[PDB]
Curated annotation (Swiss-Prot), chain C:
The chain crosses the membrane at residues 8-28, 35-55, 71-91, 105-125, 127-147, 159-179, 196-216, 228-248, 264-284, 290-310, 319-339, 366-386, 401-423, 439-459. Residues 29-34, 92-104, 148-158, 217-227, 285-289, 340-365, 424-438 are cytoplasmic. Belongs to the complex I subunit 2 family. A construct which produces a protein lacking the first amino acids has only 5% of the wild-type rate of deamino-NADH oxidase. NDH-1 is composed of 13 different subunits. Subunits NuoA, H, J, K, L, M, N constitute the membrane sector of the complex. Its EC number is 7.1.1.-. Coiled coil: none annotated. The lineage of its organism: Bacteria, Pseudomonadati, Pseudomonadota, Gammaproteobacteria, Enterobacterales. Changing residue 388 to R: Shows 30% of the wild-type rate of deamino-NADH oxidase. This is NADH-quinone oxidoreductase subunit N. Changing residue 388 to C: Shows 5% of the wild-type rate of deamino-NADH oxidase. It catalyses: a quinone + NADH + 5 H(+)(in) = a quinol + NAD(+) + 4 H(+)(out).
UniProtKB/Swiss-Prot annotation, chain D:
It catalyses: a quinone + NADH + 5 H(+)(in) = a quinol + NAD(+) + 4 H(+)(out). Its EC number is 7.1.1.-. GO terms for biological process: aerobic respiration; ATP synthesis coupled electron transport; electron transport coupled proton transport; respiratory electron transport chain. The keyword Metal-binding does not apply. Pfam families: Proton_antipo_M. Residues 22-29, 104-121, 195-221, 280-285, 335-339, 447-464 are cytoplasmic. Belongs to the complex I subunit 4 family. This is NADH-quinone oxidoreductase subunit M. Disulfide bonds: none annotated. It is found in: Cell inner membrane. It comes from Escherichia coli (strain K12). The lineage of its organism: Bacteria, Pseudomonadati, Pseudomonadota, Gammaproteobacteria, Enterobacterales. One of its GO terms (cellular component) is membrane. The gene is nuoM. The chain crosses the membrane at residues 1-21, 30-50, 83-103, 122-142, 174-194, 222-242, 259-279, 286-306, 314-334, 340-360, 383-403, 404-424, 426-446, 465-485.
Length: 55, 54, 467, 504
């Protein structure tokens, strides 16, 4: 039951991982930190899906 | 509900229909020679009919 | 026209075989010996194969208005001669155990070879009739050879009444066409009024009995169970191989066969032949009835090529190669059945349940039946697949989608019974001319394997023969 | 040059094993091991000697080695063997699986054993010939002749002619379900060649000129369905996969190694190589049907895997779940997705082969097939269940195994192209866990008193453990370090994707 429940969370975790590569390209944390505001001049609505599902 | 596999069974119905239709065709054969000649007349009838509708 | 030496060289196949009947009949009346008659008959048929080279020295020409000799007829005469050669070599081991009068067999097979090599050469509707009946009278009488059983006579009588009935339908159709047309010559015919088409349908009835088509197939099980296995080798291969040539030539030459009215009717017969063969063929547990069921489907595949003879020139070689592959497959399979009856044994006990084992009894002979039985189906590395492949290509070429689909689904249905017999020869077990009979079927096994893997040389022969 | 020899060694070995059957009975085991060693030598020589890191945009025709020979000149049918980068991965995989097949059959003497091995080399050589095939007829002939000798394997070696359930249901469904669709794709080949013959005027059966043949819309769609039907009955797709569990549960597990690990490869190989490039617009129209069938396959195989009580049918129903990821990968417009499918596909073979070897190994230890009958064998076996735990662990997406990087780059590329069908697809990992744990807990966790026969257990020999140890270490290196084989396949995958992109 722990194994099933932790893999449900890991599916939820990998969902945000797909979205971050689709939106910002690089998955390194720091390069992500000063790449996130550069790519987000126009659209922001989909980042809540990334971050809520990351959460 | 998936203790037996449904789609394997539901695409086996070609074999079911073929075997049962093949059994019916075997039962259509008789061995009495009068009906063999009747088959010859009834083939002539349908061939002439199928030629006269063309 | 009169007789010229060109005509005699062209007629050399019909001549050597006829001289063989006379010499065989004189030899029967002189000594009545099995060894001498078998030797004399096989020498004449081998002499006919040698003389095929000499008619190849002659070109495409006529002998009489009855016959036309082309290179197409050269190949069909060859198919009939090897089947006659095949049936005498399978009959000697079966007839050694026969009680008496063991010598009339080769005389009737020789008459049937005359009939077969007369339907190869055809140009007039009368030669069509002199050929059908010359071969039927030995097939009237040879399925009734060894009438001492309770089923050989049964089989002979059923085939006798039905074959005379088909010949009467063919003859009545043959005249109802000639009422419109001024001549019965194939070429001169058709020079779409309903009487000519109605006469044509009657000839289809009289021809589709012997070709085992869908509403006339009822004889093909029973006589194949009743007849001797040496007769079944000839009755499966030579008769229908010879008969298919004349029915193809009539539609190629006659302009009435160009019209779609006859084309639709023959296509439906071909459609139903595949289906009504390959569905009733599953339940059989008898090997002779099993081969008789497959014969109906094989002649159906020949028809789905023949309907598209008039669209594209590839149908000529397609029919030719499937006939060559079909000859070799059936001769090997029926030879193994006859080779299991090495004595006369009264009634031979052959069945699919009787063929459990047979690899630990006789391993070589089981391999031949398996190779040929996989060749009947459509498995590659066998000549039947290349023949199957051309008939699919011909149906694709002529846009006969229902017919080519029928071959595939007919192949899909018919794979089942061929494979059971192939594996039933691997379950747990329940003289000099015999070695010669084994050599014939083993020679055919090597041929079907090497012409399935490497099929080009047979195509070269076929395009050499086709005009 | 090397390609004629590399497809012929399997057939040459079958002739020689059956020749030396008269000389001895312990010969064909040792003959077969060396002959498959030569097969991998030529395959690994092509990996090392060839320029595996070649140009990524060298067109659709690109081959490290190529053979041509006239076979039937009337249609231009030729022995057009030609090896690409991803085709070379397939050849090295089947050479390794052939070594495992001939190693699992070691110490297996019978009334006849040369017959078994000539058939064994014949079927493995048939798969190699499909993998090296550019001419359509040669591809089809090899596709259909690897399919005949397995029937004899399931028939005469499924059980030795005692029970009739090893032929009339299992082997017969295996044979018919493949051959009807094989004939379908043959008439598909012929319809494509005839429309090309109308266009140009030459009878050709070659892939390069059939690649760009002009066809009107609404025509090539039917031929694409015709290709896909034969490519959907060999790898397990949703409507037609009933043959797979019957085939794996009855054949000996060496025949099951051939039936699972490498026969499932060739259909997705053909979807990558022969179906995608020939029909770009038809495949672009057919794509969403392929995605729906892919997601249905993953969920369906896992449920049927959870619901089953035996082991051979259990791993046989994992395979249909695994191939759904591959089908969705192929039917998308992403280079990363295709390269994920290749690593997932090689790992699929490597993760099914070890499980089948071990399931057969467990049966011959205990003489009992039903999984729920046993339980708690961990205190008795010393190396089988520990190694089996990692293989069940490698089935799902556990990192350090090749399956994780495989399935998961597909999901990256799949979300790159289309969101909603991918977000459904990811949930198969949760379902992969539940049938993986079901296998593990029903078989090994528990008390040994669940079965009376679980109280006297044999030992495990050295060579089986050696060939299990090699697979687990090989699969871990593919999970941790998958770069070398991705650099190999990059250019072949790239031109297929560029053609699928540019031709639409």
């Amino acid at each position: 039951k722990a194994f099933v429940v932790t893999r449900v969370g890991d599916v939820f975790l990998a969902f945000a991982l797909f979205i971050l590569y689709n939106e910002l390209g690089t998955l390194n944390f720091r390069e992500m930190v000063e790449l996130a505001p550069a790519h987000f001049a126009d659209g922001n609505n989909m980042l809540m899906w990334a971050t809520l599902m990351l959460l | 509900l998936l203790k037996r596999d449904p789609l394997n069974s539901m695409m086996n119905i070609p074999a079911v229909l073929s075997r049962f239709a093949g059994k019916g065709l075997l039962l259509s054969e008789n061995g009495y020679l009068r009906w063999y000649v009747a088959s010859m007349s009834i083939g002539a009838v349908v061939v002439l009919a199928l030629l006269m509708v063309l | 026209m009169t007789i010229t030496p060109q005509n005699l060289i062209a007629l050399l196949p019909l001549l050597i075989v006829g001289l063989t009947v006379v010499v065989v009949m004189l030899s029967i009346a002189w000594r009545r010996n099995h060894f001498l008659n078998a030797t004399l008959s096989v020498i004449g048929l081998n002499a006919a194969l040698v003389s095929l080279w000499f008619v190849g020295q002659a070109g495409a020409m006529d002998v009489t208005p009855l016959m036309r000799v082309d290179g197409f007829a050269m190949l069909y005469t060859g198919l009939v001669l090897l089947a006659s050669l095949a049936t005498c070599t399978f009959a000697y081991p079966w007839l050694e155990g026969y009680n008496d009068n063991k010598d009339e067999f080769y005389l009737l097979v020789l008459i049937a070879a005359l009939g077969g090599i007369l339907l190869a050469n055809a140009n007039h509707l009368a030669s069509l009739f002199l050929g059908i009946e010359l071969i039927s009278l030995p097939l009237f009488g040879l399925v009734g050879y060894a009438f001492r059983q309770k089923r050989s006579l049964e089989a002979s009588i059923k085939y006798t009444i039905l074959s005379a009935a088909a010949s009467s339908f063919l003859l009545f159709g043959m005249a109802l066409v000639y009422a419109q047309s001024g001549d019965l010559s194939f070429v001169a015919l058709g020079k779409n009024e309903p009487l000519l088409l109605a006469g044509f349908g009657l000839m289809i009835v009289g021809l589709g009995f012997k070709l085992s088509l869908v509403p006339f197939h009822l004889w093909t099980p029973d006589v194949y169970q009743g007849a001797p296995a040496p007769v079944s080798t000839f009755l499966a291969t030579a008769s229908k191989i010879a008969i298919f040539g004349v029915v193809m030539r009539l539609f190629l030459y006659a302009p009435v066969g160009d019209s779609e009215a006859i084309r639709v009717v023959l296509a439906i017969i071909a459609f139903a032949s595949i289906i009504f063969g390959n569905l009733m063929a599953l339940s059989q547990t008898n090997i002779k009835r099993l081969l008789g069921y497959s014969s109906i489907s094989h002649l159906g595949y020949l028809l789905v090529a023949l309907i598209a003879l008039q669209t594209g020139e590839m149908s000529m070689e397609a029919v030719g190669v499937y006939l060559a592959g079909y000859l070799f497959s059936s001769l090997g399979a029926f030879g193994v059945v006859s080779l299991m009856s090495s004595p006369y044994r009264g009634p031979d006990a052959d069945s699919l349940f009787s063929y459990r084992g047979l690899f630990w009894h006789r391993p070589i002979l089981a391999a031949v039946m398996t190779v040929m039985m996989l060749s009947l189906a459509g498995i590659p590395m066998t000549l039947g697949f290349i023949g199957k492949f051309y008939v699919l290509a011909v149906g694709v070429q002529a846009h006969l989608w229902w017919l080519v689909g029928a071959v595939v689904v007919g192949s899909a249905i018919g794979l089942y019974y061929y494979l059971r017999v192939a594996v039933s020869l691997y379950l747990h077990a329940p003289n000099w001319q015999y070695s010669a009979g084994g050599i014939v079927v083993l020679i055919s096994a090597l041929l079907v394997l090497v012409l399935g893997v490497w099929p080009q040389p047979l195509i070269s022969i076929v395009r050499l023969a086709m005009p | 040059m090397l390609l004629p020899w590399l497809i012929l060694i399997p057939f040459i070995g079958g002739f020689l094993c059956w020749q030396t059957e008269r000389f001895g009975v312990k010969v064909p085991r040792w003959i077969a091991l060396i002959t498959m060693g030569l097969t991998l030598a030529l395959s690994l020589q092509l990996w090392l000697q060839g320029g595996y890191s070649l140009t990524q945009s060298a067109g659709i025709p690109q081959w490290q080695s190529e053979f041509d020979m006239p076979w039937i000149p009337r249609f231009g049918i030729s022995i057009h063997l030609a090896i690409d980068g991803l085709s070379l991965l397939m050849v090295v995989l089947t050479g390794l699986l052939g070594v495992l097949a001939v190693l699992c059959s070691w110490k297996e003497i019978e009334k006849y054993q040369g017959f078994f091995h000539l058939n064994l080399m014949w079927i493995l050589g048939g798969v190699i010939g499909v993998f090296l095939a550019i001419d359509m007829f040669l591809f089809f002939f090899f596709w259909e002749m690897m399919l005949v000798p397995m029937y004899f394997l399931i028939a005469l070696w499924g059980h030795k002619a005692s029970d009739g359930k090893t032929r009339i249901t299992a082997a017969t469904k295996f044979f018919i379900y493949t051959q009807a669709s094989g004939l379908v794709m043959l008439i598909a080949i012929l319809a494509l060649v005839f429309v090309h013959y109308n266009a140009t005027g030459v009878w050709t059966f070659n892939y390069e000129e059939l690649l760009n043949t002009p066809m009107s819309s609404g025509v090539e769609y039917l031929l694409m369905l015709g290709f896909f039907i034969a490519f959907a009955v060999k790898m397990p797709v949703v409507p037609l996969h009933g043959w797979l569990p019957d085939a794996h549960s009855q054949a000996p597990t060496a025949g099951s190694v051939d039936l699972a690990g490498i026969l499932l490869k060739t259909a997705a190989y053909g979807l990558l190589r022969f179906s995608l490039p020939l029909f770009p617009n038809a495949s672009a129209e057919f794509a969403p049907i392929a995605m729906w069938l892919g997601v249905i396959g993953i969920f369906y195989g896992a449920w049927m895997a959870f619901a089953q009580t035996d082991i051979k049918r259990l791993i046989a129903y994992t395979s249909v779940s695994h191939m759904g990821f591959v089908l969705i990968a192929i039917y998308t417009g992403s280079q990363l997705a295709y390269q994920g499918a290749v690593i997932q596909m090689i790992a699929h073979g490597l993760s099914a082969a070890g499980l089948f070897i071990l399931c057969g190994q467990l049966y011959e230890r205990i003489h009992t097939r039903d999984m729920r009958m046993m339980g708690g064998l961990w205190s008795k076996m010393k190396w089988l269940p520990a190694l089996s735990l990692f293989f069940a662990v490698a089935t799902l997406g556990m990192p350090g195994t090749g399956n994780f990087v495989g399935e998961f780059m597909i999901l990256f590329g799949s979300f790159q192209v289309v969101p909603v069908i991918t977000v459904i697809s990811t949930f198969g990992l949760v379902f992969a866990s539940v049938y993986s744990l079901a296998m593990l807990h029903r078989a090994y966790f528990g008390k040994a008193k669940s079965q009376i026969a679980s109280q006297e257990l044999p030992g495990m020999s050295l060579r089986e453990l050696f060939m299990i140890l090699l697979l687990v270490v090989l699969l871990v290196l593919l999970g941790f370090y998958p770069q070398p084989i991705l650099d190999t396949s990059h250019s072949a995958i790239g031109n297929i994707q560029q053609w699928f992109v540019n031709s639409v």
